[PDB]
Structure 1
Amino acid sequence: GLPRRIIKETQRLLAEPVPGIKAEPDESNARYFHVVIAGPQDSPFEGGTFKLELFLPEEYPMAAPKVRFMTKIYHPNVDKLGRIKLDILTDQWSPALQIRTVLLSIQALLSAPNPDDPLANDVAEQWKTNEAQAIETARAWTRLYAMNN
């Protein structure tokens, strides 16, 4: 079986889910999590349901969870393939952080886009240049990609 840590995090995630976040292990791989983040209220993504996958690499928790959007989203820190620029996923990882905190941080990222530390440079420039329009695009994309999906 698994490290007891992974069993404990999983029991606690299933028994006490993060609000706005569905997260459950794969029937056949307890290290793989099917995730759905609801677009935050008062964000361009409101009404959206965003699919995400999370994977615990064999070195976890000494290595960060791998996470990616599987739903297309217009956001300065998410690229075309759904990869996520978030400091705790890379150089600010600590093994005292949990899946719960990775999930909360991504949710919070949706509510608080960071164009100044871009992954998606086009989206970021548009977020700086013309925020209003960048927000309306994010809205349209929510409707296009993140509704009945």
Structure 2
Amino acid sequence: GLPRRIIKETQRLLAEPVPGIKAEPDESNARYFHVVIAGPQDSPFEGGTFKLELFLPEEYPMAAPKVRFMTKIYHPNVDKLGRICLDILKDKWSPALQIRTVLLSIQALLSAPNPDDANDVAEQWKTNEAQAIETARAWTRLYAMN
């Protein structure tokens, strides 16, 4: 049976959305969510709209939700297949947390990136921040506007 917790979280997402975030369940799959996060004001991603997908696996909420960026983005925490490096999506998940926490955390990651982890983009952000920010802006113009 579909866990009551998933039904209630879905209702809550529809009734009280997170500002700057759209999140809707897939018509064919109640465990599958289509998410859009607006690029935060004053960040390198300002003006962009970023598509993500989220999936609630069998053992949710004991296991974390899985989340993938679908829109190409230049960010210390997002690898080349869109996988997100975020502690509460791995080690630090707990059933005390919920979908809304994950969505707010990703928005927060975009608003003010923190490059300490380890990968080429994080390294650029640490030692050549100006270029990293310009590249993130360029990719927002190129991939997050249409």
1:66 aligns with 2:90: no
The 2-side partners of 1:93 and 1:137 are apart by 31
C-alpha displacement of 1:121: 1.2
Identity %: 98
The 2-side partners of 1:82 and 1:63 are apart by 20
- Residues matched between the structures, number: 146
What is the match of residue 111 of structure 1?
111
1:24-59 deviations in Å (ceiling 9; x for gaps): 000010100000000011100011100000000010
C-alpha displacement of 1:62: 0.1
The 2-side partners of 1:125 and 1:69 are apart by 21
TM-score (structure 2 length as normaliser): 0.97
C-alpha displacement of 1:3: 0.7
TM-score (structure 1 length as normaliser): 0.95
C-alpha displacement of 1:114: 2.1
C-alpha displacement of 1:111: 1.0
Q: Which sections of structure 1, spanning at least 5 residues, go unmatched?
A: none
Give the alignment of 1:12-91 within 5 angstroms: 12-91=12-91
Give the RMSD, CA atoms, in angstroms: 0.9
C-alpha displacement of 1:93: 0.2
C-alpha displacement of 1:145: 0.7
Q: Which sections of structure 2, spanning at least 5 residues, go unmatched?
A: none
1:81-113 deviations in Å (ceiling 9; x for gaps): 110000000000011100000000000011121
1:5-35 deviations in Å (ceiling 9; x for gaps): 1000000101111010000000010100000
Q: Name the SS of the counterpart of 2:22 in structure 1.
A: strand
Q: 1:133 aligns with which of 112, 131, 134?
A: 131
